[model samples]
Target: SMAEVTIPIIVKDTTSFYWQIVLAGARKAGKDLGVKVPELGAQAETDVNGQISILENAVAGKPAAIVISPTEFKALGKPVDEAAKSVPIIGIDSGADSKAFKSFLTTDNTQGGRIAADGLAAAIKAMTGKEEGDVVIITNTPGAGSLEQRRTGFLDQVKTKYPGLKVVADKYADGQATTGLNIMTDLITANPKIVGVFASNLIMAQGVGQAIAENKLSDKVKVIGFDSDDKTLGFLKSGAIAGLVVQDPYRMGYDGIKTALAVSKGEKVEANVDTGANLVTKANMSDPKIEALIN
Candidate 1:
């Protein structure tokens, strides 16, 4: 019966390069597990209200299990709580503010943040042959728990590990490409000596890459992004961006649904499942494991 049941996966947005891979993993798991996985998400990543509405509707459907990556951490808390009353809720990618999840599956973002810091620092050192310079970080949203961990991990690592690097600015792009571009543009303009940058998400990475290219600073500034997609690959191939701290969103989706299915069958699952995170450089991008992660 569990295998025959259909599960719903709600993510931030379906079109995002990050979410798309996550969805693909869910679908693949659904087929392998013989469970129907109906994927749903908002059009925009920042649309908390839209996702809340979807949660309410999913509750109405009374599915066996539901998985969600909450966009607005606090805003989605109540909705996730309400949905959990009806079906098992497996939180993925991001977390909710409430204790309503049966299980949580995602990359260990804090470690990923530290990885980003080290990756950026190394890239900067290799690119410019300089070990000390000003750097800035761009985040997706203000209260996003995962991104917050990333930002914290990055700042802490940079503070302790790389004494030569000075962090000059930190800004939020609200998870929009245009906003990311504008914020990065301003940071580049204000800090001409900026040698390194970290974008906490894919959209912001795109903006950062665009800004670097537009200003002809690709040779000067080394950019590090959180995730990879077609655009990110382009940036990497063109050498506009130096490295990407990649997460296994595909595994998150696969494991999220698998855990939910197991729970629905009265099988216990791990409370926290860390899919994985690794730094992908141009040199290692051709590796089979890394290629699988990117595609």
Candidate 2:
């Protein structure tokens, strides 16, 4: 028997909608595994030092495992590596590279991106009655690896399948809800006829939703985004967002802790894990066990 069984999860930002889903997933897993998972979240997603401090502090508590979602993949490399030495660290969402953890629990983000794009294209076809229109992408950053892949996945699909669709503008929203909202506002002012808006993630999607709500364009323009959070779900329910490209963040969170536990006990796990993805629309919002995930 060990000293105790405690799992500590550190996230880049607690205020995020998706991060909440991640924590909820971990709680569900903890219940199933008969362990307690204490959570630590950063005030800002880019606060690298703060995230490292959280890991260092959590490890000092002698937690049986630590689950971390890095602010940036490489920024947390040293601290993640250091914490892994004391107790195994598992990554949920974005990982800190090979030497930093026992395993990564996340979605196939490129495929997710492509899914987001396909969802938007279909919604565009429905709302505008046109198979294609000029598209604008809202990303937290242009070069961030995950966002970049999403952009590539989305654009590639639009070009190859939706021949009439084109990406007319690429904007950066600083990955903040308010920033994304402002960027969306500007895009609306600039392109009055744009039929589709693809936000690379949840916050960006919320920004687009806010713009649609403010401009009274929900009935005319179509918007699709990534990550399933309450805000996005609410928007979907209220007819604000066309749909959400959801990756099972709860699965990621639960698996992060379980993965570490298995590694600690020398159990075998697949090196590459496929967490999977789905599209969330109002049509299937009532699926049982989906609402139960909020806990």
Candidate 3:
């Protein structure tokens, strides 16, 4: 039976709600497709060594395949290179230097960033009658592969498309929600003219939402966040966050395992798969598709 076929899905953080959604998809796929699945990760995305060790341990199991979202770009490369020697590695969420993944699946992070910028532009106009004012970007961490693409594309889109909008600050946090809150507060206070923000990841998005609520700046500082969880969706409902750039994480995990399964069976899969990205706002949150995503 295919029950003996184990595929472990390893993400940056097992405790994160976003990763939890991914794991749920993996679980659904496991049951539907008749494969055993194991969800594994560090307690925090900050722990690169922990994830690498987990990957090696999964490799030692000689599982059918491994699905991983690398924590950091540079550090995760060597481990993936070695692991793929014995088993197929399917990468999702983030990137690593190694080009060894049999099939890599992710949202189009660059386009996701551009979408966030468009969302922010609309919100800025709604706030001030025109998209002309100071804006800020909150990055969850530095040296992150996907986050950089997001930040860069977000910045470029703002510059190219919305010339009236000025980016006064580009802030980085060390993968902590509180750090995001603190930085957002500092930016809000330091730049009183700020009217829009792009919190490019979930943890930072949480902190930014807190900052918005605590300062009562949601009406003033519109934020477009990436990924989703309970708190982020709560913020969306409460109007603390204007729009969220949600990725098809469920499909990422579901299809990740699906693709790895095919690879293990000596079948071919698309080399690069973009699950997708969408901007969710309060106006459309109740739509069937949007509700399906958050739920």
Candidate 4:
């Protein structure tokens, strides 16, 4: 007997521009695969309980497969294991460290972070022509494995490769735009010698950019942010932001759905997939592929 296949996609938030890009890709994948997809998401970014409810509801559909960016990787473990008995569960973007997943379609966030460090190094060198300066890092959370890897990649590389550069302090934005802005303001007031800043995500980047504009510190600080936000693009064009590290979010969604479908059909799928990431600056920000990150 042939089984019916209906794909399910669970995202973090529908309000985020990043999520819109993800949904656009998933919808396109559904259109091409000839399978109707049920797109579900959490009400709040940190509401693990809401995410759990969404997952439980999705499970009732007996979906052929699921593509989800878990709110907390740990919270998804039990539900995912339960769902696996009937269908494959694929993770998109951030996910649990468990190997229980059939496959993972996500960004090389560590590499992206490393590239950010590398890009910031170059930009600062070009601007100041000095090998060393005090830099600070703003991040989502220090405990997240992916974010930790990114911080490690950036911090370690700068310390080892750029001897003239020094990291004076670091802070967590907790994924809140207002909080991130406040953190940047405090950093500016406390450390005027700070030459560069590295933010781990687009939301943090926007906050930092706002602070830079408000304080008129653009002349002194070089801000390099992660991921491309619309404001990040304008900041780049207006010379408020130096550059950005970009990953393929649309591909994360498109490939997530495609690979999840393959797994549900008992087809061979790559256990580990790398969609790749890149460094975007004003020079090549307009390139077709890079432009897609914003549009």
Most accurate candidate by lDDT? 3
Write model 3 residue lDDT over 1-295, tens digit each, in one string: 4446999999899888888889999999999998898989999889999998999999998999999999999999999999999999999999999999999999888998999999999998998898899999999888778898998889999999999999999988888999999999999888899888899988988999989987787778898898788898899888899999988889989999999999999998999998888899988888898788877
Candidate 2 segments whose C-alpha is farther than 4 A from its true place: 31-36, 60-62, 141-146, 287-295
Q: Candidate 3: how many backbone clashes?
A: 0
Residue 285, candidate 3: alpha-carbon lDDT: 83
On residues 93-174, what C-alpha lDDT tens digit does candidate 4 reach at each position?
A: 8766456788988778777777888888887887888756999999864445456667878888887888888899888866
Model 4 bad stretches (over 4 Å): 1-4, 142-145
Residue 86 local lDDT, model 2: 84
**lDDT score for residue 7 of model 3:** 93
Clash totals, every prediction:
0, 0, 0, 2
Superposed on all Cα atoms, the candidates' RMSDs to the truth, in angstroms, are 1.7, 2.7, 1.4, 2.3
| Residues 100-154, model 1: lDDT tens digits | 8999998888898999999999988997786799999999777776898899899
Give lDDT per model, in order: 0.88, 0.77, 0.91, 0.80
- Give the best candidate by TM-score: 3
TM-score of each: 0.95, 0.88, 0.96, 0.92
Residue 91, candidate 1: alpha-carbon lDDT: 92
Model 3 whole-model lDDT (C-alpha atoms)? 0.91
